[PDB]
Amino acid sequence: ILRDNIQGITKPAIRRLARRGGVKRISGLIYEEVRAVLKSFLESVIRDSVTYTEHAKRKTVTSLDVVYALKRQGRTLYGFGG
Amino acid sequence: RDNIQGITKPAIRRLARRGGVKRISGLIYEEVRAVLKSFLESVIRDSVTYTEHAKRKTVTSLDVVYALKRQGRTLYGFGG
Amino acid sequence: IIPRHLQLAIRNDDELNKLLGNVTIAQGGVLPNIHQNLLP
Amino acid sequence: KPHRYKPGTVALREIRRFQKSTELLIRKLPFQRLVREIAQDFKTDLRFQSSAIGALQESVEAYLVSLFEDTNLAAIHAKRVTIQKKEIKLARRLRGE
Amino acid sequence: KPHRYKPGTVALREIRRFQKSTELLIRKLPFQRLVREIAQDFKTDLRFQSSAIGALQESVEAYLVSLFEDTNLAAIHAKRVTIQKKEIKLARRLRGE
Amino acid sequence: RKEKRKGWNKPDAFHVCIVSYQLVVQDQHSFKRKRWQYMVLDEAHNIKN
DNA sequence: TCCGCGGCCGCCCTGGAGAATCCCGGTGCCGAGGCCGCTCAATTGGTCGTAGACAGCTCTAGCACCGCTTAAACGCACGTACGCGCTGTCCCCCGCG
DNA sequence: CGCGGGGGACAGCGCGTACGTGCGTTTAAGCGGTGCTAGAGCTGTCTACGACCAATTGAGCGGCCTCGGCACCGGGATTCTCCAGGGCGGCCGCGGA
């Protein structure tokens, strides 16, 4: 729950995700590098989310909070709380 | 007439040299010319739209700046 | 509706896809495009 | 002889299935453990509601699927079909990330 | 003994010279009447001022040079010394276009 | 289970099948379609909730 | 030199086989949208203002050309060297338990 | 997590030609000037043209509950593909007169 859960996105999970990109073979070192990329993106989103949460005088983080966090990325298409 | 060909083959060769390519394919010159045409048409449709809105027959620097603003280019310097 | 309908409506329309396609699709999935060099 | 399919044969009907079906493909509880373990560092003891978790996984899944499609396009551009580290880094760099 | 340099090194010296000098690579009047032609079809009887056109040429040159740099990075990705059409299309498409 | 239920297609099939509690709970969707005659529940104390 | 013939015999075509197809129904289940309350800001009227182009001077530089002076382009001829073709190698993750 | 293996990633070397670089000679732009006139623009102005709350109001919603549709296998040749013999691309070699 709070210790070494980065393996939640597992190697078979990464292989299945790469199946959706249209690839036949996934190399061994692909899994951990895409894990690091996902970690970086998730950290970048959640930093903005938690900073907004602190600004809003709120203790809980809502879905619309991360919606605004991703809003300044610059696309903002459909989704919950759009 | 035929003014797009005014950009010469040695000019595109130097431009690709700026891109750090030792040997450049022959079709690459005309492909670069074609993507340049697409770039200019995408910019200039918006520029002409803004010119027509602006109640002005002359395309000003601010006109080009506003045309470039929407497409995400956001240039600096000229009309900044 | 299933959000797959939303994804099909978005991706089958050229202007919608050209306009914006990065932010999450709400359970609509994607359109996995395959190539002609993979499958035997 | 056993009906051993050649590699790349089942993939046809498999992509026929999962292109139409639109369910999830990642274990939920490990993912919520991950989002917790990354949240406590930013803010401990967060009282997570039932929401604000599925949106994150859907967003990251869409982003990584787009990245994987771009990586496959780069691999085909590289006169090959398989994925590799260089394909991923090139796709990410050309995406502005 | 004619003095003919081996191919490739003069390319490097040209690259260095174009790196030190940051002048416009396309003559002003060619861009002028190219813009005039491409604006003829949209609306007729349009007069272009002295300004607003050097900005167009500098923006086009800068973004096209960035595209060339991405294309060359993808060419090194492809392990070759030549630019290719698939290189250019991968550079364009993966940039959100 | 697919091999077991491949022969389940025939009408006038096996006179009886045996499936446990949680297996029935999981495969209710597969089982709800077929019509039966005699259902037997064992140790009804465990099913008291 | 003819060519009879015999061998290396192994490969696309053909027949057999493995799993899925996406509807016909069964059984079971599933929250849209109109309907007793409602509410509440919208819709005209009257007042308030105000500023923003109609003229009108204004002002200032666009521009098309007249007339010299070069600048990279262009063709060609040879260099060469590296993508590509052709081929060989090895490799390690897909399919399955 | 484990193993067979086979299509696919990756490299070595010849081709040769495809740009690349060094010869002359241009086609059209840069610069000096100019004479104008044609578009860009704020000031008296004055009016019409937008905003907001009284009497009403309608209109869409707040909440439930029916029911014609969701989910997918009994039910299954064909599609999708994979793998073993047959005639063959013939290939080719070797030897009496």
Residue numbers in the entry:
A (entry chain C): 21 to 102
B (entry chain D): 23 to 102
C (entry chain E): 79 to 118
D (entry chain B), E (entry chain A): 37 to 133
F (entry chain M): 783 to 831
Q: Paper's wording?
A:
The yeast SWR1 complex catalyses the exchange of histone H2A–H2B dimers in nucleosomes, with Htz1–H2B dimers. SWR1 is a 14-subunit complex that is a member of the INO80 remodeller family. Here we used single-molecule analysis to demonstrate two-step double exchange of the two H2A–H2B dimers in a canonical yeast nucleosome with Htz1–H2B dimers, and showed that double exchange can be processive without release of the nucleosome from the SWR1 complex. Cryo-electron microscopy analysis revealed different populations of complexes showing nucleosomes caught ‘flipping’ between different conformations without release, each placing a different dimer into position for exchange, with the Swc2 subunit having a key role in this process.
However, in light of the new single-molecule data above, we re-examined these less-populated structural states in an expanded dataset to see whether these provided information about how nucleosomes might flip between different conformations. Two classes were of particular interest and resulted in structures at 3.8 Å and 4.7 Å, respectively. The second structure (configuration II) also showed a longer section of DNA overhang bound to SWR1, but this time, it was the DNA that extended from the upper gyre, which is released from Arp6–Swc6, that now binds across the same surface of SWR1 as the DNA from the lower gyre in configuration I. The DNA overhang from the lower gyre is released in this structure. Thus, the same DNA-binding surface on SWR1 binds different overhangs in each structure. A third contact region, involving eight conserved basic residues (K319–K322, R325, K326, K328 and K329), are in a loop that sits across the surface of the SWR1 complex. This surface contacts the DNA overhang adjacent to the nucleosome wrap, but a different overhang in structures emanating from either the lower (configuration I) or the upper (configuration II) DNA gyre. By swapping which DNA overhang is bound to SWR1, and then releasing the nucleosome but without releasing the DNA overhang, the nucleosome can flip and rebind in the opposite orientation but remain tethered to SWR1 by the DNA contact with the Swc2 subunit. Consequently, we interpret that the two major states that we observed by cryo-EM represent intermediates on the flipping pathway.
